[PDB]
Amino acid sequence: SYDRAITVFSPDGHLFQVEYAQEAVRKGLCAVGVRGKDSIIFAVEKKSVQKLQDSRTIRKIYKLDEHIYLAFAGLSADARVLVNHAQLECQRFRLNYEDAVDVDLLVRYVAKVQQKSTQSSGSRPYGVSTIIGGFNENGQPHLWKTDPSGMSSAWRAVAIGRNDKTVLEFMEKSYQENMTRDQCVHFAIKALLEAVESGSKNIELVVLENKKALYMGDDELRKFVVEVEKEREE
Amino acid sequence: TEHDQSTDIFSADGRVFQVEYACKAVDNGSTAVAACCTDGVVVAVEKILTSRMLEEGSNDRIHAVDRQAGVCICGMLPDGRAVVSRARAEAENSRDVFATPIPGSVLASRIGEFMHVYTTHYAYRPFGCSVIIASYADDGPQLFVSDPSGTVAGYYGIALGKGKTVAKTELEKLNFKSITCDEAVVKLTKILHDVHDKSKDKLYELEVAWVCNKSNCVFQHVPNDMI
Amino acid sequence: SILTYSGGSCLAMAGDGCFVIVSDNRLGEQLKTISMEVPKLHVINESIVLGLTGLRTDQQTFSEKVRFRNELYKLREEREIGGKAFAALVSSMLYEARFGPWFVEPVIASIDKRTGEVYLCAMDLIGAPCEPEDYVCAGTCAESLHGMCEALWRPGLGPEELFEVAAQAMLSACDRDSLSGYGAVAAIVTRDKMTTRLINGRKD
Amino acid sequence: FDKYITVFSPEGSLYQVEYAFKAVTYAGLLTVAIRCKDAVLVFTQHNVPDRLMRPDTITSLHNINKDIGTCITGRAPDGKSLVQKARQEASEYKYRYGSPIPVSVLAKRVADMAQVRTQHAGLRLMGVVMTFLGMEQNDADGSWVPQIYCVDPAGWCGSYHACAIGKKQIEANAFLEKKQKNAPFHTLSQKDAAMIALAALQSALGASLKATDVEVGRCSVEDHCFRRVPDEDVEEWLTALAEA
Amino acid sequence: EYDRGVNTFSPEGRIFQIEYAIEAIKLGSTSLGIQTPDAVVIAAEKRVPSVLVDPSSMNKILEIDYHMGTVLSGMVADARILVEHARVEAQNHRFTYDEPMRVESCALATCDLSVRFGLMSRPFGVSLLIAGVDENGPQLWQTDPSGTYTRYDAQAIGAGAEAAQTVFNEIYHRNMTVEEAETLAVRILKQVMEEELTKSNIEIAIVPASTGKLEVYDQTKIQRIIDRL
Amino acid sequence: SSRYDSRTTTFSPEGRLYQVEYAEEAISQAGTVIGILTTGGVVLGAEKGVQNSLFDSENMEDKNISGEKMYKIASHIGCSVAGVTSDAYALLNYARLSANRHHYTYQEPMAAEDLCRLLCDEKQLYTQYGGVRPFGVSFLLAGWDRHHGYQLYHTDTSGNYNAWRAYAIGQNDQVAQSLLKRDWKPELTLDEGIVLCLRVLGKTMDTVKLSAERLEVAVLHKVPAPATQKLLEPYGVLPKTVPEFKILRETDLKPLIAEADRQREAE
Amino acid sequence: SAYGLTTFSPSGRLVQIEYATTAASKGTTALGVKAMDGVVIAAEKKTTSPLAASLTVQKVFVLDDHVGCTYSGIGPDCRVLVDAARKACQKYRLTYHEPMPVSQLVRHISSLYQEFTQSGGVRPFGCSLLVAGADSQGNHLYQVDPSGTFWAWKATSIGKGSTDAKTFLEKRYTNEMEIEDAVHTALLTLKEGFDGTMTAENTQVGRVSEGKFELFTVDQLKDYLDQI
Amino acid sequence: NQYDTNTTTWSPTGRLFQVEYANEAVNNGSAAVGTKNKDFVVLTALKRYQEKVFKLDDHVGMAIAGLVADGRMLARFVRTECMNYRYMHDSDNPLPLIAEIVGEKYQRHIQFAGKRPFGVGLLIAGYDSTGPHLYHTVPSGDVFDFKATAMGLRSQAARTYLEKHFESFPDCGLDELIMHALKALAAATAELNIKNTTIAIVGKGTPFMVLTEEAARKYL
Known part of the structure; x- marks a missing residue:
């Protein structure tokens, strides 16, 4: 059994393992979340279009339960x-309490898993940030971000990964309360193409509504990228 | 010169330097002498006092390990103390499991084995004491020394610590076939008073114990009216 | 008894480069009949048939363990297990559970593909083998099967005469047994072919 | 970085093993064992440098059990640790199989204990050579044959007709090689083998020996036990050698 | 960084891991508590990293139990772990002996867990002000990564610490009212903040000896204090 | 002893796990391995070392379980490896055992993506916990399940995985992807897919004639389902077809090494 | 100490595994030859002095009635593997009541070698094995290296004189050797690289034939040496 | 310095460096003083509100200097030893046995790699069937039995004063003894009063007790 102390303080209150984990997040592909009236939009950048990559690509937005996604x-x-x-x-919780876990609860569980990995001898920290969004059973959306230190926090919109700061600046100006489903998609795509080269097939996109979810197809996602490539020339 | 940081490592010459250094603690500690006589064993140590306001009986170097056996710690005192608790467990073991007072040769063997093991694991360090073992069980009067290496040797007479090269010269003038416990208490006390350095250690007292036929083979500090 | 809770019987006989193994089709809960279409035979490979009787939950669980170990054997070893090793293996697993047993009693029947030599084994529930040259049987009408086979079986028989012996046995014995019945399934195995037959019987 | 733990150097050598072999000569003592027709003898140095030491307490010879003896060469307290594990091994073997461990098999188990510290990190190697001595029975006719096994820090276990270990071993082993050529050791009397062994020591140490300077152990067909040879029986060998 | 271990002592008898953890707390937000005779008051700078953050979610004031609350400074995620042990201890007490945990016992309990490292790889980079009322009136205690805990008439922790401890050695007397502390609080937040000060940008809580309940102030009621300035 | 710790699981000053990176270099040095997805199955092809007269066969009773580079994991999944051979055998045991546990529990074949995830999770575990080196292996998994049809996967030392229509790991993998990129198309037969694999190996080994003794090919395809034992299992139901993993011998590569040399001369 | 000693270096190499391999190559020569009906393995056993007892030095080992081995490199490391191998064979018997096939035994040795290249606080085994046996699939000769890699061979050699031994076997090896002429070839190959005169007391030989592995006694081996 | 990181490394002159540094943690805490006559022991301590004096059982308590989290551990430990003892015997844990086991606990933390030294000194004061007792424990595991001493910052001065007066302490009454303990603690320094100086007492008739601010007014 290996028990070495990996994450330790150094001469000015720095935990370097945590910092370098956050460096690894900065190199990772960009992801964005945007909270509307009654819809959450997760949008991520994919590596790069290839002939060989499988058309049915692997998904980089995961379902945690019937009403909660993660990117x-x-x-x-x-x-x-x-x-x-x-x-x-989430399933443990259904079994212990019958009701379905709240997003805000599930976020603290995850964030505490990250925090523990910064203090548990034997182990390095995860090198991941998450964006987690979902609904209550009273239909009101929530969007959370978690970082490698284990710190969580709620947002109206948020970017992580590469060109985090640039996208985030664009979004501070342009964000608007009570955007529709279609406005939210528009605004999310727009936000992404401040970091990313083209918008053909290097974007996946989930529209998480109350009582539905959609991994958008390539017909509906092309429609929106051309509505947005037309607006970027003005 | 990275070869001297753990005791789990030989040097290129076949030495174990962590064990040499621990032996250096002992050689700069206070001087103890002992003598194996016809009727028993006597030990004497010199306590360097760090303060005129210590109660008497402070920082005793001689401890009983069994009714019939005792140790005098030379070197670092708290290291020595961990060795005393093991020695008592061994002595207790022998009465519990085998119904016998531990033989002196066997008790010394077990102390050595114990000191040896802290010479082989990266995670521990050698002890910084030597232990004089004085016994008088069914095997008769015995005097052994264990050292930080875990080497154990029996002796007629011995001296450890800073005074030890002169004390050894005076212990050579005794006669170990005749000398009794009563005569030895006198002679060993004279040797500690002569090898004492007055420039460097102004405050000291002598500790002296014995296991003899007088004391009904019980290890015990000698009565204070005999110095 | 617990070995008789579920019902069922199995029988295997040897001939000359062939065997036959038969089982009844009944599954029960003591006297209440749940199904009439549960044969107790499992084909391991081209050469080995397994019969299991005893409590059905443990037949189901122990045959899944056998299947699992066999699959791993075939990938490690890149070959099919022979009748004798399979039986030694089965034995080992029963005895692993010596102080808390699988309530099964297996009947293994096999043929060495090369030499054409027939190996039969039956096991008690902690894996003691009984490997005669004529036949083996197990389950709720094993007493009544013994004497049918002692009087019908003879050395030397070929596939078609061994099949009649072995079907008359199973039927006449199931008919004096309330917990085994509803006709039978038989596998007949030679080096060259494996024939299966569903035999008619009484509807009680 | 390979000089400090159990990893291979770039020439496939283990450095801690080589240095553990130096620990063996560092200790300054010489041991000679020799197997003759009916017996096996071991002759080690008994150094008592200090006039105040109780000389019957300094020993390199130990019993592992009634019938097996050892001679430790090298770092003495590492020796005694192996004596204790050997004793534990012998005692477990006897409880498990119900007969005393053969000396060949004992030696192999102690070798395995050494090998394991050459391959795991964090425990120092024992800087000794253990020479085991005892009689072993042949399966055929049930006769008893004397053995000598040595185990070294590398975990190597081998049997010998004779062998010197320790300071000046090179000079003493050559002397025994010369005297092997006259007549095989297995054809010699106890006395004749002894004169060879004792003169191997005298040649190598560059001295003349008294009986007090050596300690000697012995297993023989007559008495299978490993036992010390009394000082008188060694004076009669040393007297025989000063003459011839 | 790995040259010396988690346990190593400095040549003047400090443990390195603990010195460095205390430095960490200095780069924190600022937070403080003030004890009157009537009540005990706590407050913090929030310090959101943008206007897209919902500010609710970034609380530095947490209820431990009905009669006590904390304000944390330093690594927020580490504080979550302490504040959870404290919630559990406070409820074990009530379970076992049917009464509220004393505030001192709670600070003691939170400090035991601070020094369990060698097991955890490192200290907590966190300090806590615990504030509440028991039988000894309004109290304010402070714990730090060394596992020392200590009672204070008024303290601050964080980046604005050393500047708030010269508005204390001036304006702080033992004998003030609710009002003068609620105002002295915001005076110091205005000083050592970097931002302009707003009702959304700070948090205030009180535990008055009158009722023995922690109350968390609305933004309506924090307007009234910036006004009084 | 802690000063001689290498610190295999410790991030370095840029968010980089050096041992994960160096272990990926090791795979680039290894024999070329190619996977191609076709309409009628998956094809895996691998270059072998140079053939010493003195080699011998193991002479295994069944020839479709393991070549030098191709391994069956279960009857609907096979693979090829590049990198540290003994590391591959430890993981292939892990995967065989996981696939068979799933059959034990659900009595149905594990989905190839599910299998792939378990494999990659095992790898990731040696990157975070445990003070030891990571596995220095990359896999190509060929799979068939009813959820997703034929599937080809690649698994990298990080514990990452991704799906492909054609891929290449080992030595000359950029040169190889260049060629597949050009010549792959979504309408391939399994016999064309095999050809295309042979050409791509012929152009990375650097020989005009394809030495059949330097090539290994395996196919994951479907074949008509065997006997339906309706008497021993009255509620058994088999589909018309079932997956098979097959390690093509020289007698099946004769008309296919011939069709790759008529496409080598006409170019 | 539970950290790994064997790690990746920037170019993808695992150097502790190459130094171990180096040590297996510096060992005394051993070789093997597979005939059409048996296998023969052989090894030099020279002692350092004539004071050593020759008869007790083992280089070839029985692992079970049907299989044996020899090694080069670090003797003491070889004993660990011989012990593990011997146990795995008895274990297979208890389970299946038949002899463990040589292919399975060699994958067990491999995975033990492979453990010691990833496990924390251990160095690799510094020896390579030749394994020779007979099972229901016939007669086999395998080599296993410190990496845990194994190959089946018709004929090979490991240790210091092995490039030359292998060259010499390329030429003289045929697919239709009988077992007695494989013993001859084995011995003849040892003779070429051997320093000094080669005797029945500094060479050891094993032989699979009729499904049984057996060491030659000194006397059996003197017979075959006066003929060459 | 190559030899001063871990506790498990001797230095070539036979010193344990990490152990001396733990010992500095004590020389840099607030001063405390102890003294004893025929039937009482008095602890005083200069608080720098910081718990610096703990009660360990009815008949024994201690002052600390240095790392308090270490002091608190050593207290949970002695308290649990005394209780055990009184459960088994119905009498008081004898004081020499308390000192031994504290000494040994300290020593174990200076010889293994998975243990840190304790950076805290104790003055243990108690009273049992053999009279009053004042022990000093330091991080090297040493345990002195004193008639008077001082530890912590500037505590040399306290030590000097005591050196002139202790010979008279056998004869003193409990009031002069308390004053001597204060003139000593004063010598290690703002002046003493009931909000920054502690006094505790134990002896014949007298379970161990910290004087309240009321009772302490008399002396201060």
């Missing part, structure tokens, strides 16, 4: 572990 940035394998723990947690 991330950073080490994709670490994140898959994190998503596993969270799926277990």
